[PDB]
Design a protein around this ligand. Structure first.
Ligand SMILES: [Ca+2]
Ligand SMILES: [Ca+2]
Lengths: 33, 33
């Protein structure tokens, strides 16, 4: 004679974010002379 | 000279319930990245 609560069910996922939106690189190779 | 009550007859059955109505299994194998 056991009474159960009937709520022992689960499901699991994951998420992440490990980088910045943009990357910037420079090529200014001229001199104001 | 014996007086009988005439109620000595019986029949027996059985019943059971040994499991929960539903079972749940998860397959969430994608990542919000
Ligand atoms: Ca970066
Ligand atoms: Ca079960």
């Amino acid at each position: 004679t056991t009474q159960s609560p009937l709520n022992s069910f689960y499901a699991t996922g994951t998420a992440q974010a490990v980088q910045e939106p943009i990357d910037v690189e420079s090529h200014l190779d001229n001199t104001i002379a």
